[PDB]
C-alpha cells in the first residue's frame, strides 16, 4: 500500500525496459469496469503510444487504451477495437475516463470531464480477473514482449479503476477533484512494482 | 407512464431494426405544435440522420426533423421542406426546440436556447392526429420501412411535445431547466415501446 | 396608438405585397434625426434588402437603410449614398442606430451598441416632412413600386425615431433597453398600418 | 484654455485644408517626452495617414506618429524613422502612448495599455521648442504644405503630452482614465485653433 | 548586492558589445538547478537569440537557453541539446522556468506558469561551478566571442537561479510573485557588471 497523492510516474526518454506493474486484488471476472487517469506527452504528433495495458494469458489486449497518431483514441477490450476520432491535438495534460458494460456492450469515453458519444463493443463478454497491468509499455504477452515504438514518454498518474460503471455525476467529481473510492486500483493505496528507467516526481497538472 | 428524468435512450451502433415508439393520446388534429429534445452524435460529419419522425397513414413525413450532412438542419411538415443552414459543426450535446403554426405558417427553430430566423411552411395545413412517432429511425410508412443509412447513432432524450406555440420566454425556461408541463408528449410521463438494441442510461448532458 | 413592447413584425417569406406603414406626426422638416431598430434575417449572404424606407413625393430615397450583399450597410439621405463596409457577416439579431445632422453632415452608425467612424453626407440638406415610412419593402415612389428582390425576410421591430442627434450615453441605454421618449416614431405608441402577409409575434431578441 | 473632457475632434471626409493647431507653452528644448491619444478610423486598410504632426522650422518631422498601410505604426523623431509592425488590423478605437528619451534613445510604444518592445532612436538628440503641432494633416513645412493623401479621416482626441518619460504604472492610469497632469499639452486645458471642416462632438470611446 | 525589484535590463538595438555579467557565489559544482526569468522581444519571428548563457572554461555551452527561429525553445546542458517545439509564436512578455536533475536527467520547462512534458538530458553530468554568466549575448569562450546575430534585443529581467529542482507549487508562486528565496542568483540582491549600450528601466510586465 502506497499513498501516491500528488505524485506521478515519469518516463523521461523512449526505452524498451521501463514500466511499472500495478497489482490488483481480483477474484471474480469483470462484467464491467471504469478506468480513469491523467497523462501528458508530446508524442501524439510524432507516433502512437500505449496508455494503459491490461493483458491476460489468453488475450494480450484484454483491455487497452491506445493513442493512434492521425486517428485519435483507440479503445479495445477482448481484442476488438473501437475508435474515438480526434482531429485537433493540442499538447497539454489530459484526463480520460472510460467504462464498459457487458450486459449492454456500451462504452463511455470522457475526455477532460466532457463525454463522447456512446458506442458498442463486445456485448456479453467477460474480462479476465488474473491480469497483468503495465504502464509505459504495450504488452504482447503476459507482462512481456514490449515494443519500444509503443512506449509512453512523459508523465502518467492518478490512475483509478472500479469494477462497475460510473455515472456522469461521479465522473464529474473525479475530474473536478472530489472524493471517490476505487475498488480495484486506488492511487491512494497502490501496490505497484517499478522496473527500468522510471521516476516518481510531483505531478504537473493541478 | 414512466418518469424518464435524468435518463436517456442510447442507440449504440448503426442498425436497421432499433427504435423506440412514442404513444400519443391525440384526438384533435394539430393546428400548431412545438417539439423540443436533446441529442448527441458524431454522425453529423459522416452522414445525415433522423432526429424525430412523426408519420401519418397518408403522409410519411407529417413532421420530420432531420440533419443533412454538409447542409444543416432539415425541417419538413406535410412533406414540404425548409432548411436552417449550419456551416460550422462541433461535436457536443445539443438542445433543439422547433414550433409551427397553421394560421401563419411561421416556423421557429431554437438551438441551445438561441433562436434562428422565422420562415414559412405549409400555411393553413392541418397535421394528422392518428400518428406514429419513432426515435432512432426514419419512417417511410406507418411505423415501418426504415433505412439504415438514416439511423441515429448516439443519445436522445428530454423529448417533450406541446400542441401550441411556445413564446420565447417559455422556450427559455425549458432550456434553462425550469418546471414546465408538456401537453402532447411528456418525458416525465412517457408511454413508449422499445424494440431492438436500445438501452436506457443516465443522460450525458446537464 | 399601440403599445408594441416585446412584439415584433415578421415577414416570413419573400413577397412583393407585404409591408407595414408607419405613420409620423411631422410638421417641421427634419434638420437632423436618429433612427434605431432591431432586425434578424439570413438574407445577408444571399442578396440585399431594404431595412427602413423613408420616401417623399420628390425623392424616393429621402432616407434609406439598406444592406448590399458582399459590401455591407448602405446609408443614403437625399439620394446620396455612404457605405459602412462589413467583411465578416455572422447571422444573429442585430441592433442598428443611425443619425444625421444638417449643420455638419456628420452621420453616425452604431451596430450592437458599438460605433463606426463618422462620415459626411448632404451637409445643409433638409429632409421632407410629408413622408411615407415603410418596413419590409423598398420604395421607388410614394408608398409604392416595390421590388421583390429588395424584400426583407425575417423579423424587424423596436423601431424608434427622434428628430435630433442622440449622444453616445443615450445610444447605450437604447441598446441596453432603457427608457427613452421618441418624438417622431415610438414603439410604445405606434400608429402603423399592416398590409399583405405580415404577422405580429413576440420578439426573438432580448 | 478649454476643457475638452468627453469631447473629441472629428474629421468627417478626406480634405486638404482641415486641421486643428495645438498651442504649447514651450521654453526649453525637449530632452525626452511622452505622447498619448485616442483615435478611430477605417483608413488603415485603404492607405496611410498622419496621426500626430510636430514640426519645426528646420525639420518638418521633428516628431511624427504615422500609420503606413500594410506595415504598421511609423514613429519618427528628428527625421529618423522606426517601425512597430502590425500584421492584423481590426477597426476600432485605439489608444496609443509613445515616449522618447535622449540619454538612452529608448522609445516605448504602448497600444491599448499593452507595451511593445523597446527600440532605439536618435540618442543624444535635442528636440526643438518652437514647434507647430497639427492634427488631421501631415506637415511638410512649418504649419503648412499638407498632402491630402496623408489626411486623417475619423475621430481623434484625448491627446496629452509630457516633457518626461512615463513609467509603466503611470501609463496604466492614463489608459484607464485616471487623474494625470500633463505639463506640455493638456486635454482639460487645451489652447487650440480650428481651421477648415472639423467639428467638436462627444467622444465615441469610453 | 543590488535590489533590482521592478527594474529590468533593456538592450535597445542589435549590437555585438552589449551585455551584463551576473556574478554568482559558487563553490561546488551543480548536481541540479532551476532558472527563471522574464523577457520580451519581437526577434522571435526574424531570427534566433540567446536568452541565458552560462559558460565554463572547458565548455562554452555548459547551460544555454536559446530561441531558434521557426523551431521553438532550445535547452542544452553540457553541450547536448534538447528541444521544446513551439509552432505558433505571439509577441508578448513571457516567463520561463527550467530545471535539470543529474540523478535522473529529467528537465522541466515551464512557460507562463504552464509546464511542458518532462524530457531527459545528460544524466549523471556535473555542471561546473567556476562559470561566467552573461545576458544579451551568446558565449563561444569564457565571457567572450559574441556573435551579433545571436544578440537579444529587448527586455530581460527577474532572473533567479537555485541549486535544486523547484516543485510545481514553487514554480507557481515564483510566476505570481511569491516569497521565494534564491540561493545562487537573486534579483533582489544582484551582484552584476554592466557593459555596452544597456539600460535599467522599470519592467513592462506586471
Ligand atoms: C489487436 C488490436 C491491436 C490494437 N493496436 C492499435 C492499432 C492502432 C495503431 C495496438 C497494437 C497492439 P500490438 O503491438 O500487440 O500488435
Ligand atoms: C420528402 C422529403 C424528404 C426529406 N429528406 C431530407 C433530405 C435531406 C438529406 C429526408 C428523406 C426522407 P426518405 O428516406 O423517406 O426518403
Ligand atoms: C439611388 C441610390 C440607390 C441605393 N441602392 C443601394 C444599392 C446597393 C445594392 C438601393 C436601390 C434603390 P431602388 O430600388 O429604388 O432603385
Ligand atoms: C522623412 C520620413 C518620412 C516618414 N514618412 C512615413 C512613410 C510611411 C508611409 C511620412 C512621409 C512624410 P512627408 O509627406 O512629408 O513626405
Ligand atoms: C553546440 C550546441 C549549439 C546550440 N545552438 C543552438 C542552435 C539553434 C539555432 C546555439 C549555437 C551556439 P554557437 O554560436 O557558439 O555555435
Ligand atoms: Ca498487444
Ligand atoms: Ca506490442
Ligand atoms: Ca420519410
Ligand atoms: Ca427512410
Ligand atoms: Ca426598389
Ligand atoms: Ca427608391
Ligand atoms: Ca512631413
Ligand atoms: Ca506631406
Ligand atoms: Ca556557445
Ligand atoms: Ca556564438
| Minimal CA separation from D57 to chain E, in Å | 30
> For chain D, what's the residue count?
206
Q: What nine digits make up the cell of B68?
A: 443533412
Residues E182, E174: Cα–Cα separation, whole Å: 10
- Closest by CA position to E150, among listed E33, E18, E6: E18
- Closest by CA position to E160, among listed E139, E181, E179, E143: E181
How many Cα atoms occupy the beta-carbon half-sphere of C181 within 13 Å? Answer: 0
Strands D154-162 and D32-40: antiparallel
CA E54 to centroid of chain Cα atoms: 8
Q: Which atom of ligand 3 is found nearest the CA of C140? A: 15
Resolution value in angstroms? 3.5
Residues B61, B77: Cα–Cα separation, whole Å: 7
Residues forming beta bridges with residue E95, ordered by sequence position: E38
User: Does residue A112 have a known ligand-binding role?
Assistant: no
| Interface E:C, ≥3 CB–CB pairs < 8 Å | no
User: Does residue E169 have a known ligand-binding role?
Assistant: no
Q: Which atom of ligand 2 is found nearest the CA of B60? A: 15
Residues B78, B30: Cα–Cα separation, whole Å: 12
Quote helix, strand, coil % in chain C, to nearest 5: 10, 45, 50
Contact B27, B35 (CB under 8 A): no
Q: With beta carbons under 8 A apart, name residues in chain B contacting C154.
A: 117-118
Residues forming beta bridges with residue D202, ordered by sequence position: D7
- A197 to chain E: nearest residue by CA? E104
Q: Cα angle vertex C151, ends C150, C152, to 5°?
A: 120
Q: How far is residue C41 from each of residues C15, C72, C110, C136, C155, measured CA to CA in Å?
A: 15, 14, 18, 12, 7
Q: Which residues line ligand 4 (CB under 6 A)?
A: D 48, 60-61, 66, 68, 74, 76, 79, 81, 138, 140, 147, 150
Residues C142, C163: Cα–Cα separation, whole Å: 21
Q: What nine digits make up the cell of E154?
A: 529587448
Q: What nine digits make up the cell of D51?
A: 496621426
CB contact under 8 A, A199 and E116: no
**Cα D50 to ligand 13 centre (Å):** 9
Q: Which atom of ligand 5 is found nearest the CA of E145? A: 15
**In D10-43, which positions are buried (b, 16+ CB within 10 angstroms) versus exposed (e)?**
bbbbebeebbbebebebeeebebbbbbbbbbbeb
Residues C166, C108: Cα–Cα separation, whole Å: 10
Answer whether E200 contacts ligand 5 (Cβ < 6 A): no
Residue partners of B181: CB distance under 8 A and separation at least 6: none
**B199 membership: H or E segment, kind and range:** strand B199-202
Which strands, in side-by-side order, build the sheet including C192-195? Answer: C80-85, C72-77, C63-68, C49-56, C131-135, C19-22, C192-195
CB contact under 8 A, A106 and B42: no
Q: How far is residue D21 from each of residues A25, D191, D198, measured CA to CA in Å?
A: 86, 9, 12
3-state per-residue secondary structure call for chain A: CCCCCCEEEEECCCCCCCEEEECCCCCCCECEEEEEEEEECCHHHCCCEEEEEEECCCCCCCEEEEEECCCEEEEEECCEEEEEECCCCCCCCEEEEEEEECCCCEEEEEECCEECCCEECCCCCCECCCCEEEECCCCCECCECCCHHHCCCEEEEEEEEECCCCCHHHHHHHHHCCCCCCCCECHHHCCEEEECCCEEEECCCC
**Cα D60 to ligand 12 centre (Å):** 5
Within chain C, what is the greatest distance between any pair of CA atoms?
Answer: 41
Residue partners of C81: CB distance under 8 A and separation at least 6: C74, C75
Contact E101, A199 (CB under 8 A): no
Residues C70, C47: Cα–Cα separation, whole Å: 9
CB contact under 8 A, C12 and B167: no
- D86 to chain E: nearest residue by CA? E91
Residues E114, E172: Cα–Cα separation, whole Å: 9
Answer whether B62 contacts ligand 2 (Cβ < 6 A): no
Identify the nearest ligand to the CA of E53 by its number. Answer: 14
DSSP B127: B
Answer whether E79 contacts ligand 5 (Cβ < 6 A): yes
Q: How far is residue C16 from each of residues C136, C146, D166, measured CA to CA in Å?
A: 9, 6, 63
> For chain B, what's the residue count?
206
Write down the residue that cell numbers 429534445 correspond to: B37
E78: three-class secondary structure by DSSP? coil
CB contact under 8 A, A91 and E116: yes
The DSSP-derived string for B129-159 is SS-EEEESS--SBTTB---GGG---EEEEEE
Chain A residues contacting E, CB < 8 Å? Answer: 10, 12-13, 40-42, 91-92, 153-155, 199, 201-204
What kind of experiment solved this structure? X-ray
Contact D38, D8 (CB under 8 A): yes
DSSP C164: S
Residues C80, C140: Cα–Cα separation, whole Å: 15
The residues after which chain E has a C–N gap greater than 2.5 Å are none
Residues B125, C59: Cα–Cα separation, whole Å: 43
CB contact under 8 A, C204 and B85: no
The DSSP-derived string for C18-68 is -EEEE-----SPBSEEEEEEEEE-SGGGT--EEEEEEEESS-TTSEEEEEE
How many Cα atoms occupy the beta-carbon half-sphere of E118 within 13 Å? Answer: 28
E56: three-class secondary structure by DSSP? strand
**Cα A123 to ligand 6 centre (Å):** 21
Residue partners of E145: CB distance under 8 A and separation at least 6: E60, E139
**In B35-65, which positions are buried (b, 16+ CB within 10 angstroms) versus exposed (e)?**
bbbbbbbbbbeeebbbbbbbbbeebbbbbbb
**Cα E49 to ligand 5 centre (Å):** 10
Contact B171, B110 (CB under 8 A): yes
CB contact under 8 A, E167 and A203: no
User: Does residue E150 have a known ligand-binding role?
Assistant: yes
| Minimal CA separation from D108 to chain E, in Å | 10
Q: Cα angle vertex C175, ends C170, C179, to 5°?
A: 60
Write down the residue that cell numbers 486598410 correspond to: D45
> For chain A, what's the residue count?
206
Residues C32, C105: Cα–Cα separation, whole Å: 9
Q: What nine digits make up the cell of A149?
A: 515504438
Contact C67, C84 (CB under 8 A): no
Residues B179, D158: Cα–Cα separation, whole Å: 53
Q: What stretches of E41-191 adopt beta strand conformation (E)?
A: 49-56, 63-68, 72-77, 80-85, 94-101, 106-111, 114-120, 131-135, 154-162
- Dihedral over Cα of A118, A119, A125, A130: its sign: negative
Residues C82, E24: Cα–Cα separation, whole Å: 67
Residues E141, E62: Cα–Cα separation, whole Å: 11
Using a 10 angstrom Cβ sphere, with 0-12 exposed, 13-18 middle and 19 or more buried, the burial of residue C161 is buried
- Dihedral over Cα of C74, C77, C81, C84: its sign: negative
Neighbour count for residue C78 (Cβ, 10 Å): 17
Residues E72, D30: Cα–Cα separation, whole Å: 42
Q: Which of D194, D199, D200 to mutate to test the interface with C (most CBs of C within 10 A)?
A: D199
CB contact under 8 A, E116 and A12: no
Dihedral (Cα; A165, A170, A175, A176), 10-degree rounding: 180
Residue partners of B50: CB distance under 8 A and separation at least 6: B64, B65, B66, B136, B137, B138, B150, B151, B152
Neighbour count for residue D177 (Cβ, 10 Å): 10
Contact A51, A37 (CB under 8 A): yes
CB contact under 8 A, D155 and C119: no
Residue partners of C53: CB distance under 8 A and separation at least 6: C64, C133, C134, C135, C137, C138, C139
- Closest by CA position to A161, among listed A56, A86, A63, A48: A63
Contact C150, C50 (CB under 8 A): yes
Q: How far is residue A79 from each of residues A19, A58, A59, measured CA to CA in Å?
A: 22, 10, 7
Neighbors of chain A with 3 or more C-beta pairs under 8 Å: B, E
Residues C6, C205: Cα–Cα separation, whole Å: 9
Q: With beta carbons under 8 A apart, name residues in chain E contacting D116.
A: 42
Strands D199-202 and A19-22: unpaired
**Cα E68 to ligand 15 centre (Å):** 13
Residues E26, E22: Cα–Cα separation, whole Å: 12
Write down the residue that cell numbers 445539443 correspond to: B94
Residues forming beta bridges with residue D39, ordered by sequence position: D94, D156
Write down the residue that cell numbers 479503476 correspond to: A161
Contact E13, E153 (CB under 8 A): yes
Q: How far is residue D150 from each of residues D66, D73, D197, E205, measured CA to CA in Å?
A: 9, 14, 16, 35
3-state per-residue secondary structure call for chain D: CECCCCEEEEECCCCCCCEEEECCCCCCCECEEEEEEEEECCHHHCCCEEEEEEEECCCCCCEEEEEECCCEEEEEECCEEEEEECCCCCCCCEEEEEEEECCCCEEEEEECCEECCCEECCCCCCECCCEEEEECCCCCECCECCCHHHCCCEEEEEEEEECCCCCHHHHHHHHHCCCCCCCCECHHHECEEEECCCEEEECCCC
Strands B106-111 and B72-77: unpaired
Contact C144, C17 (CB under 8 A): no
- Closest by CA position to D98, among listed D80, D84, D86: D84
- Closest by CA position to A112, among listed A5, A189, A22, A206: A206
**In B79-93, which positions are buried (b, 16+ CB within 10 angstroms) versus exposed (e)?**
eeebbbeeeeeebeb
**Cα A49 to ligand 6 centre (Å):** 12
Answer whether C67 contacts ligand 3 (Cβ < 6 A): no
Q: Cα angle vertex C104, ends C100, C109, to 5°?
A: 35
- Number of A to B CB contacts under 8 A, please give it: 36
Q: What nine digits make up the cell of C117?
A: 467612424
Residues A190, A41: Cα–Cα separation, whole Å: 23
Using a 10 angstrom Cβ sphere, with 0-12 exposed, 13-18 middle and 19 or more buried, the burial of residue C193 is exposed
Residues B124, B80: Cα–Cα separation, whole Å: 13
Q: Which of A120, A166, A171, A172 to mutate to test the interface with B (most CBs of B within 10 A)?
A: A120
Amino acid at each position: 500500500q502506497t499513498d501516491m497523492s500528488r505524485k506521478a510516474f515519469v518516463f523521461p526518454k523512449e526505452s524498451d525496459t521501463s514500466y511499472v506493474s500495478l497489482k490488483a486484488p481480483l477474484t471474480k471476472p469483470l462484467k464491467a469496469f471504469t478506468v480513469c487517469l491523467h497523462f501528458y506527452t508530446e508524442l501524439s504528433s510524432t507516433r502512437g503510444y500505449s496508455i494503459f495495458s491490461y493483458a491476460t494469458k489468453r488475450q494480450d489486449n484484454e483491455i487497452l487504451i491506445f493513442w493512434s497518431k492521425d486517428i485519435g483514441y483507440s479503445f479495445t477490450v477482448g481484442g476488438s477495437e473501437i475508435l474515438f476520432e480526434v482531429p485537433e491535438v493540442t499538447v497539454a495534460p489530459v484526463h480520460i475516463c472510460t467504462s464498459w458494460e457487458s450486459a449492454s456492450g456500451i462504452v463511455e469515453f470522457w475526455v477532460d470531464g466532457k463525454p463522447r458519444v456512446r458506442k458498442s463493443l463486445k456485448k456479453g463478454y467477460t474480462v479476465g480477473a488474473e491480469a497483468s497491468i503495465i504502464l509505459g509499455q504495450e504488452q504482447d504477452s503476459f507482462g512481456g514482449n514490449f515494443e519500444g515504438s509503443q512506449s509512453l514518454v512523459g508523465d502518467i498518474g492518478n490512475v483509478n479503476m472500479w469494477d462497475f460503471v460510473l455515472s456522469p455525476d461521479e465522473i464529474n467529481t473525479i475530474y473536478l477533484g472530489g472524493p471517490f473510492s476505487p475498488n480495484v486500483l486506488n492511487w491512494r493505496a497502490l501496490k505497484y512494482e517499478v522496473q527500468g528507467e522510471v521516476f516518481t516526481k510531483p505531478q504537473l497538472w493541478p
